């Protein structure tokens, strides 16, 4: 007896609650900042349109048709065929992403706690930068908040699809959006807008002569859409034929892009206002945003509201991360949902511990050459497993399915849009992924 979404809106809100999270505010800010701004942004937007939306609809189609996990969907639909390595890669991508995703989500909790206990109301004597560096370098303090966030994620995944994942507050996501628009409006009035908006929207094409910017653009695209690791195959496996998938794919990609763009209009005028470099790195928003909340009279409550709504977005994103291997181990080992969520959840928490330490005592340690542990596991997950698993997912429908079945299961016809969707799964998206892989790694 497999689970289904109880409500009709349950599927689209789950997929939206999974795509909109830390990647839109935290990750989109520091990757766009260190990749130059507008030229990376255009490549990113182009990848969202011509690669992201089709592969999202591909994941939806695969999951609903098979009614099975990330891996089981390929076993079921193509028995004995090697397409299930994408689900396998997707499962491993969940262990890795959620490991460090919970570290960054723990930072949200720590800042939330400091705004409840009235600590970060005024600037600390070491500044907002030094406050952040001292917290993340601390060996044990980030672990406490990381484990705290993981317990919240395990709890919801253990409760189930009907009573846990789907019972997410329908108001927190539109409230996060209203606050980002209000805050993007405020930072436009701080003095660095002309330089922040030019950085964000006036392209410097000299950046685009670097293979790494395309690789960072395709990774941020796959990351922010919860794409390439079967998470949308999993959420699609709980929906019935009473659903139109193409509108869901466009809506998730459209809304998810709206957050990142607005998050950019909020962050970068503030960065140039504070005279800060756009390449600050992973802790950019954690240094820039507390400064912004300090310049506001009612700023403490803004930070309280911001880190509540942001953590809620991270909470629902982590739930879809954990649900991917959990659905695997429920079928594969006949584990119960509570046993798999707790076991895998505790394990993934341990996996992220070296990522948390790599901001401090393990900062000198590297795995892949020139990247620390956090950046090494983020790289192989976001830059290797997510884009390759997406490429295989696209070739699966484009070349392993009959055209009529691909169109019928995705609620498309042989119209211009159906032909267009089949064209990008068959050629545009996988070849673009291929060219980005080839040009980046020599």
Ligand X SMILES: N[C@@H](Cc1ccc(F)cc1)C(=O)O
Ligand Y SMILES: CCCCCCCCCCCCO[C@@H]1O[C@H](CO)[C@@H](O[C@H]2O[C@H](CO)[C@@H](O)[C@H](O)[C@H]2O)[C@H](O)[C@H]1O
Ligand Z SMILES: CCCCCCCCS[C@@H]1O[C@H](CO)[C@@H](O)[C@H](O)[C@H]1O
Ligand U SMILES: CCCCCCCC/C=C\CCCCCCCC(=O)OC[C@H](COP(=O)(O)OCC[N+](C)(C)C)OC(=O)CCCCCCC/C=C\CCCCCCCC
Binding interface with ligand X (CB under 6 A): 18-19, 21-24, 97, 223-224, 226, 229, 231, 317, 320-321
Q: Does 97 bind ligand U (CB under 6 A)?
A: no
CB closest to ligand Z, residue no? 201
Name the one range near ligand Y by CB under 6 A: 4-12, 62-70, 86-94, 135-143: 135-143
The smaller minimum CB distance to ligand Y, of residues 113 and 335, is found at 113
How far is the C-alpha of 179 from the C-alpha of 189, rounded, in Å? 16
Name the one range near ligand Z by CB under 6 A: 194-202, 331-339, 381-389, 392-400: 194-202
Quick one: CA torsion of 418, 420, 421, 426, rounded to 10 degrees? 120
Q: Is 41 exposed, middle or buried (0-12, 13-18, 19+ CB in 10 A)?
A: buried
The smaller minimum CB distance to ligand X, of residues 320 and 356, is found at 320
Given its phi and psi angles, is residue 124 left (phi above 0), alpha (psi -120 to 50 degrees) or beta? Answer: beta
Task: Name the phi and psi angles at 398, rounded to 5.
Answer: -65, -40
Q: Does 343 bind ligand Y (CB under 6 A)?
A: no
- Judged by CB under 6 A, which of 42, 49, 50, 85 binds ligand U? 85
The smaller minimum CB distance to ligand Z, of residues 82 and 275, is found at 275
316 binds, among ligand Y, Na ion, ligand X, none (CB under 5 to 8 A by kind): Na ion
Q: Does 35 bind Na ion (CB under 5 A)?
A: no
> Going residue by residue from 280 to 309, which x/- string records binding to ligand Z, judged by CB under 6 A?
---------------xxxx--xx-------
How far is the C-alpha of 165 from the C-alpha of 235, rounded, in Å? 10
CB 223 within 8 A of CB 27: yes
Q: Which are the residues after which the chain is interrupted (C to N > 2.5 Å)?
A: none
Q: Does 138 bind ligand Y (CB under 6 A)?
A: yes
166 binds, among Na ion, ligand Y, ligand X, none (CB under 5 to 8 A by kind): none
End-to-end CA distance of the chain: 49
Angle at 142 between CA 138 and CA 147, to 5 degrees: 150
- Judged by CB under 6 A, which of 183, 308, 342, 377 binds ligand Z? 183
CB 59 within 8 A of CB 232: yes
Range list of β-strands (E), 140-253: none
Q: Does 112 bind ligand Y (CB under 6 A)?
A: yes
Radius of gyration of the chain (CA): 21
What residues have CB less than 8 Å from 19, skipping those under 6 apart? 224, 225, 226, 252, 253, 255, 256, 317
CA distances from 12 to 60, 87, 228, 247, 283 (A): 11, 22, 18, 9, 31
Q: Does 313 bind Na ion (CB under 5 A)?
A: yes
Name the one range near ligand U by CB under 6 A: 83-91, 155-163, 172-180, 427-435: 83-91
Q: Does 185 bind ligand Y (CB under 6 A)?
A: yes
Q: Does 190 bind ligand Y (CB under 6 A)?
A: yes
Q: How far is the CB of 29 from ligand Z (least distance, A)?
A: 17
The smaller minimum CB distance to ligand Y, of residues 190 and 367, is found at 190
The smaller minimum CB distance to ligand Y, of residues 140 and 442, is found at 140
And the tokens for 419? 């032909």
- Judged by CB under 6 A, which of 49, 50, 78, 88 binds ligand U? 88
CA distances from 353 to 143, 208, 303, 349, 371 (A): 7, 35, 27, 7, 17
How far is the C-alpha of 251 from the C-alpha of 131, rounded, in Å? 39
The smaller minimum CB distance to ligand X, of residues 228 and 299, is found at 228
Residues in the chain: 442
321 binds, among ligand X, ligand Z, Na ion, none (CB under 5 to 8 A by kind): ligand X
Coil, helix or strand at residue 334: coil
The smaller minimum CB distance to Na ion, of residues 316 and 372, is found at 316
Quick one: CA torsion of 410, 414, 416, 422, rounded to 10 degrees? 50
198 binds, among ligand Z, ligand X, ligand Y, none (CB under 5 to 8 A by kind): ligand Z
Q: Does 371 bind ligand U (CB under 6 A)?
A: no
User: Rule CB under 6 A: which residues touch ligand Y?
Assistant: 109, 112-113, 134-135, 138, 141, 148, 182, 185-186, 189-190
Which positions touch ligand Z (CB under 6 A)?
182-183, 186, 197-198, 201-202, 295-298, 301-302
- Contact positions vs ligand U (CB under 6 A): 71, 84-85, 88, 332
Residues that bind Na ion (CB under 5 A): 17, 19-21, 23-24, 224, 256, 313, 316-317
């Amino acid at each position: 007896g497999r689970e289904q979404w109880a409500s009709r809106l349950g599927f689209i809100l789950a997929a939206m609650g999974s795509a909109v999270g830390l990647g839109n505010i935290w990750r989109f800010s520091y990757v766009t900042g260190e990749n130059g701004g507008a030229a990376f942004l255009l490549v990113y937007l182009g990848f969202i349109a011509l690669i992201g939306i089709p592969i999202v609809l591909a994941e939806f189609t695969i999951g609903r048709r098979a009614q099975s996990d990330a891996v089981g969907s390929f076993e079921k639909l193509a028995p004995g065929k090697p397409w299930k390595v994408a689900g396998l890669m997707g499962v491993a991508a969940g262990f890795l992403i959620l490991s460090f995703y919970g570290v960054i989500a723990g930072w949200i909790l720590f800042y939330l706690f400091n705004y409840i206990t009235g600590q970060l109301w005024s600037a600390p004597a070491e500044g907002f930068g030094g406050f952040f560096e001292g917290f993340i370098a601390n060996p044990t303090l980030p672990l406490f908040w990381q484990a705290l966030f993981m317990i919240a994620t395990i709890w919801i995944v253990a409760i189930g699809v009907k009573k846990g994942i789907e019972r997410s507050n329908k108001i927190l996501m539109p409230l996060l959006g209203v606050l980002l628009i209000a805050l993007a409006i405020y930072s436009l009035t701080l003095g660095g807008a002309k330089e922040g908006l030019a950085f964000l929207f006036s392209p410097d094409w000299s950046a685009l002569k670097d293979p790494g910017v395309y690789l960072a653009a395709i990774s941020q695209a796959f990351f922010t859409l919860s794409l390439g690791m079967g998470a949308l195959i999993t959420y699609g496996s709980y929906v019935s034929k009473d659903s139109r998938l193409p509108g869901a794919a466009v809506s998730v990609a459209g809304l998810d892009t709206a957050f990142a763009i607005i998050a950019g209009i909020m962050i970068f005028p503030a960065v140039f206002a504070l005279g800060l470099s756009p390449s600050g790195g992973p802790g950019l928003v954690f240094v820039v945003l507390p400064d912004i909340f300090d310049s506001i009279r009612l700023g403490p409550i803004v930070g309280i509201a911001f880190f509540i709504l942001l953590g809620a977005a991270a909470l629902s994103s982590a739930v879809s991360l954990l649900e991917v291997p959990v659905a695997y181990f429920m079928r594969k080992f006949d584990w119960s949902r509570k046993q798999a969520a707790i076991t895998l959840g505790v394990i993934i928490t341990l996996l992220g511990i070296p990522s948390s330490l790599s901001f401090g005592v393990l900062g000198e340690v590297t795995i892949i050459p020139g990247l620390n542990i956090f950046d090494s596991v983020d790289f192989i997950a976001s830059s290797v497993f997510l884009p390759l698993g997406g490429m295989i997912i696209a070739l699966f429908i484009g070349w392993g399915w009959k055209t009529s079945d691909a169109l019928a299961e995705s609620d498309l016809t042989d119209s211009v849009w159906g032909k267009l969707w089949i064209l990008s799964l068959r050629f545009i998206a996988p070849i673009a992924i291929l060219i980005v892989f080839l040009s980046a790694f020599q």
